[PDB]
Amino acid sequence: MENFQKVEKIGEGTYGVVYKARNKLTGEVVALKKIRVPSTAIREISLLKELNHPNIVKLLDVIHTENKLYLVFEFLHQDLKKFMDASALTGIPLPLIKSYLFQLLQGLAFCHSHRVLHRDLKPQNLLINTEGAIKLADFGLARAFGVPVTLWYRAPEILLGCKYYSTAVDIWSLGCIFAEMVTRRALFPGDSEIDQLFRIFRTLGTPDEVVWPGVTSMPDYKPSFPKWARQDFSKVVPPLDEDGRSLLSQMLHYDPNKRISAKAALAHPFFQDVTKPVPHLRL
Ligand SMILES: Nc1cc2[nH]cnc2c(OCC2CCCCC2)n1
């Protein structure tokens, strides 16, 4: 640690405090996470080090010293939440929305092909740079550190008590993030688990055995849930064109087994004309 000089409190996250810091020998500027140590975690985290991809935030080094654990990551200058706030008046140009979505789906595809998932995607762990790239941060952590189950981006199978949920839970999250980009408002802003579910049910309809076989058998399903009708997506992400809503709709399938995968989504026609614009950033 002594090898690092803290520059500023970036913010407080899931596993602890995140600092901007400098490596006192490489001179490299990094992001330092102090994780709040079990052998299992050290081993899992050591595997995630080898996971390298242009749309995954690079885990540079793992520092285990004095009972404590620190993760050292590649540093970027802005998270997607800051960006959207900064864009609240004008919104993000579609072509940039489309670039980001496409890059994030490449990231997900990569990690999922290795059976690694995130489980907690949110705009705050989506990081952008001046060159138009976007990258996912904190992939694989939840599983390491054994983090138990912001509810705004949680998949419905997690909320219903599925203990063995899959890569599909990340697709759900990214779909929610996609909608938020387009409209500049959160899709499902729950303030408790039940509120989260119900907001989902009010928009996509209460799930049943017709749309999601097995759902009435999930541990936290109640027959007493109110039954709401489904609303049209034309009303949920309005300006979004048809290919977009089509893709969004397949990202928000209730049935985890019918939800589109990242690899198939890359093949969606909405990406036929994809480009890589650069954003206008004030750092
Ligand atoms: N610039 C930057 C680079 C990073 N590289 C890895 N993590 C990073 C991060 O986290 C900010 C995050 C936003 C919400 C709460 C603070 C943590 N910020």
Dihedral-angle region of residue 122 (phi above 0 means left; psi in -120 to 50 means alpha; beta otherwise): beta
Q: Which domain range does residue 91 map to?
A: 78-281
60 lines ligand 1 (CB under 6 A): no
Which among 10, 44, 77 is the end of a domain? Answer: 77
Query: Could you confirm whether 241 is annotated as catalytic?
Result: no
Same domain? For 69 and 85 the reply is no
Where does residue 263 rank: exposed (0-12), middle (13-18), buried (19+ CB within 10 A)? Answer: middle
Q: Does ligand 1 lie within 6 Å of residue 136's CB atom?
A: no
What CA–CA distance (Å, rounded) separates 145 from 139?
12
Instruction: Give me the resolution in angstroms, 1 decimal.
Output: 2.1
Is the C-beta atom of 75 inside 6 A of ligand 1?
A: yes
In DSSP terms, 65 is beta-bridged to 68
Same structural domain, 110 and 62: no
Residues 141 and 245 in one domain: yes
The Cα 144–Cα 152 span in angstroms is: 22
Residue 157's contacts (CB-CB under 8 Å, 6 or more residues apart) are 165, 168, 169, 218, 256
Domain co-membership, 134 together with 187:
yes
Q: What tokens does 219 get?
A: 């541990």
Q: What is the largest CA-CA distance in the chain?
A: 61
Residue 78's φ and ψ, nearest 5 degrees, are -165, 135
CB 110 within 8 A of CB 55: yes
Q: d(Cα 189, Cα 198) in Å, to the nearest integer?
A: 11
Q: What is the CATH number of the domain that holds 67?
A: 3.30.200.20
- Residues 17, 119: one domain? no
* Domain co-membership, 248 together with 207: yes
- Hey, what amino acid is at 101? L
Report the C-alpha gap between 197 and 188 in whole angstroms: 9
**How does DSSP classify residue 71?**
E
Task: Give bridge partners of residue 4 from the DSSP assignment.
Answer: 23
Domain count, the chain: 2
Counting ligand 1 atoms within 8 A of each CB, the residue from 6, 8, 9, 10 with the most, and so the one to mutate, is 10
The experimental technique used to determine this model is: X-ray
Please name the residue ranges forming H helices in the chain.
39-48, 80-86, 94-113, 156-159, 168-183, 193-204, 233-236, 242-251, 262-266
Q: Do 84 and 63 fall into the same domain? A: no
Check whether 12 is labelled as a binding-site residue.
yes
Task: For residues 34 and 123, state if they share a domain.
Answer: no
For ligand 1, what atom is nearest to the CA of residue 30? 5
Cα 256 to ligand 1 centroid, rounded to whole Å: 29
What is the domain-level CATH number for residue 168?
1.10.510.10
Do residues 26 and 105 make contact, with C-beta atoms less than 8 angstroms apart?
Answer: no
Judgement on whether residues 54 and 118 belong to the same structural domain of the protein: no
Where is the domain boundary, 62, 77, 92? 77
Structural contact between residues 165 and 220, judged by C-beta atoms closer than 8 angstroms: no
24, 80, 167, 174, 234 from 112: Cα distances, Å: 35, 22, 6, 14, 30
Q: Is 125 annotated as a binding-site member?
A: yes
Active-site option among 85, 120, 191, 195:
120
- Pairing assessment for the beta strands 78-79 and 126-128 based on DSSP bridges: antiparallel
Please, are residues 199 and 189 in contact by the beta-carbon 8 Å criterion?
A: yes
| Residue 15 labeled ligand binder | yes
Q: What is the DSSP letter of 56?
A: B
Contact 175, 122 (CB under 8 A): no
Phi/psi region, residue 231 (left: phi>0; alpha: psi -120 to 50; beta: rest), is beta
Q: Which residue has the tokens 């219903």?
A: 160
The Å distance, Cα 13 to ligand 1 centre, comes to: 9
Verify that 145 and 184 share a domain, yes or no.
yes
Token pair 């996971």 in the structure block, residue: 51
Is the distance from the beta carbon of residue 13 to the nearest atom of ligand 1 less than 6 Å? Answer: yes
Instruction: Give dist(CA 22, CA 30) in Å, integer.
Output: 6
In the listed set 59, 77, 95, which residue is the last one of a domain according to the structure?
77
Same domain? 130 vs 26: no
Pair 21, 91 in one domain: no
